[PDB]
Scaffold this active site. Sequence first.
Site, mmCIF file in Angstrom:
data_model
loop_
_atom_site.group_PDB
_atom_site.id
_atom_site.type_symbol
_atom_site.label_atom_id
_atom_site.label_comp_id
_atom_site.label_asym_id
_atom_site.label_seq_id
_atom_site.Cartn_x
_atom_site.Cartn_y
_atom_site.Cartn_z
ATOM 1 N N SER A 22 -3.982 5.997 -3.569
ATOM 2 C CA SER A 22 -4.905 6.383 -2.502
ATOM 3 C C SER A 22 -4.205 7.249 -1.446
ATOM 4 O O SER A 22 -4.733 8.305 -1.087
ATOM 5 C CB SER A 22 -5.527 5.145 -1.860
ATOM 6 N N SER A 90 13.427 4.519 -8.581
ATOM 7 C CA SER A 90 13.987 4.428 -9.934
ATOM 8 C C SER A 90 12.873 4.661 -10.935
ATOM 9 O O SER A 90 11.748 4.222 -10.705
ATOM 10 C CB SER A 90 14.646 3.077 -10.166
ATOM 11 N N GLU A 96 3.498 0.972 -17.466
ATOM 12 C CA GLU A 96 2.873 -0.331 -17.202
ATOM 13 C C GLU A 96 3.022 -1.365 -18.315
ATOM 14 O O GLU A 96 3.075 -1.026 -19.510
ATOM 15 C CB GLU A 96 1.377 -0.146 -16.876
ATOM 16 N N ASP A 135 0.049 -8.224 -3.981
ATOM 17 C CA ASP A 135 -0.781 -7.447 -4.904
ATOM 18 C C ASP A 135 -0.166 -7.444 -6.324
ATOM 19 O O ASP A 135 -0.547 -6.606 -7.130
ATOM 20 C CB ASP A 135 -1.007 -6.019 -4.347
ATOM 21 N N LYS A 137 0.495 -7.473 -10.077
ATOM 22 C CA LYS A 137 -0.380 -7.355 -11.261
ATOM 23 C C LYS A 137 0.289 -6.614 -12.444
ATOM 24 O O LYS A 137 1.295 -5.937 -12.207
ATOM 25 C CB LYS A 137 -1.741 -6.700 -10.888
ATOM 26 N N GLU A 139 -0.292 -3.868 -13.616
ATOM 27 C CA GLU A 139 -0.247 -2.466 -13.190
ATOM 28 C C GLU A 139 1.036 -2.192 -12.334
ATOM 29 O O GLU A 139 1.577 -1.095 -12.375
ATOM 30 C CB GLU A 139 -1.514 -2.099 -12.403
ATOM 31 N N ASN A 140 1.511 -3.185 -11.571
ATOM 32 C CA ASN A 140 2.717 -3.078 -10.738
ATOM 33 C C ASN A 140 4.019 -3.455 -11.511
ATOM 34 O O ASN A 140 5.124 -3.276 -10.979
ATOM 35 C CB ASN A 140 2.596 -4.013 -9.540
ATOM 36 N N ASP A 153 5.274 -1.194 -5.842
ATOM 37 C CA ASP A 153 4.093 -1.249 -4.966
ATOM 38 C C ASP A 153 4.265 -2.226 -3.788
ATOM 39 O O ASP A 153 3.613 -3.276 -3.726
ATOM 40 C CB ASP A 153 2.802 -1.541 -5.771
ATOM 41 N N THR A 167 -6.013 -6.771 -5.549
ATOM 42 C CA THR A 167 -6.869 -6.519 -6.723
ATOM 43 C C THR A 167 -7.629 -7.809 -7.008
ATOM 44 O O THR A 167 -7.017 -8.883 -7.071
ATOM 45 C CB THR A 167 -6.041 -6.034 -7.916
HETATM 46 C C1 63L Z 1 2.943 3.581 -11.908
HETATM 47 S S1 63L Z 1 3.875 5.137 -11.774
HETATM 48 C C2 63L Z 1 5.298 4.626 -10.915
HETATM 49 N N1 63L Z 1 5.214 4.179 -9.710
HETATM 50 N N2 63L Z 1 6.485 3.901 -9.251
HETATM 51 C C3 63L Z 1 6.697 3.415 -8.017
HETATM 52 N N3 63L Z 1 5.644 3.185 -7.196
HETATM 53 O O1 63L Z 1 7.828 3.174 -7.644
HETATM 54 C C4 63L Z 1 7.409 4.199 -10.216
HETATM 55 N N4 63L Z 1 8.774 4.054 -10.154
HETATM 56 C C5 63L Z 1 6.714 4.680 -11.310
HETATM 57 C C6 63L Z 1 7.319 5.141 -12.569
HETATM 58 N N5 63L Z 1 6.554 5.674 -13.547
HETATM 59 O O2 63L Z 1 8.529 5.058 -12.728
#
Ligand code: 63L
Length: 281
Positions: A22, A90, A96, A135, A137, A139-140, A153, A167
């Site tokens: 967002s 990193s 995911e 949060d 999940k 996804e995180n 996240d 969520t």
């Molecule tokens: C879900 S994409 C993503 N977000 N992220 C954050 N927020 O640190 C990462 N390190 C990635 C990644 N593909 O390595």
Amino acid sequence: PPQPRKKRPEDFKFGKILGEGSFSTVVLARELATSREYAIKILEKRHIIKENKVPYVTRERDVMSRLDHPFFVKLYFTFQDDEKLYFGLSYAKNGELLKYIRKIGSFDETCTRFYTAEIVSALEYLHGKGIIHRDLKPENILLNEDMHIQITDFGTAKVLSPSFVGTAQYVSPELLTEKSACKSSDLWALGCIIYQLVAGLPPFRAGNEYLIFQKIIKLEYDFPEKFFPKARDLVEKLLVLDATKRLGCEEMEGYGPLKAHPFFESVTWENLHQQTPPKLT
Ligand SMILES: CSc1nn(C(N)=O)c(N)c1C(N)=O
């Protein structure tokens, strides 16, 4: 001691977008001099100000700074131009955990036990530092090259001293009843994730958001017969409506009893990130 010269956008060959939030956009970039890959989170200052997210962003940068554990996204650097903010994170090549849930359908006992333990261990550390994910999940929960978990996240995250709804599927009852958020809110999210690992789907499922919340508060969910029992018994001790009665929390004498559970009987808690992960079927 001094720090390495402040990095600028010009020091990177920015590639594919890795994720879109967002307030931000995570882009894969290659540090020119070092040829290293980072996940750069790019946030727009005007947009953050306009949407009053300055504490959200400030908190995120601060939490990510105090995290130093193999199961967490590392913040290598931060810089900024006139318009944007850059966070050097990193990079987890395998994306995911949800991807692997969708791919193989459901996880086997060995795999559920591995990634569950990794998640437990990560949460033991986070909470040890007095931080709530708020949060958490699938996804995180990212997966690096070597198939170990990397939790991310932290904008939503709360740092305790002695407000927000995550969520829907992973929201804890106390958040809907007393507008309350505690370490145990992460232990509800964990129970949800374990049920998702074994059943393929999260436990509270319905049409809209309102219907989901009704099931959560009513504790309306059910285990398929195939579910491993020890895994069911652990999920039963986490998806407890009384927050003080969850396995892993302070009122339930911490993480010891949680790690002590029969579902983790064959787990070497001691060196998990050095362990070779089980092949996902
Ligand atoms: C879900 S994409 C993503 N977000 N992220 C954050 N927020 O640190 C990462 N390190 C990635 C990644 N593909 O390595």
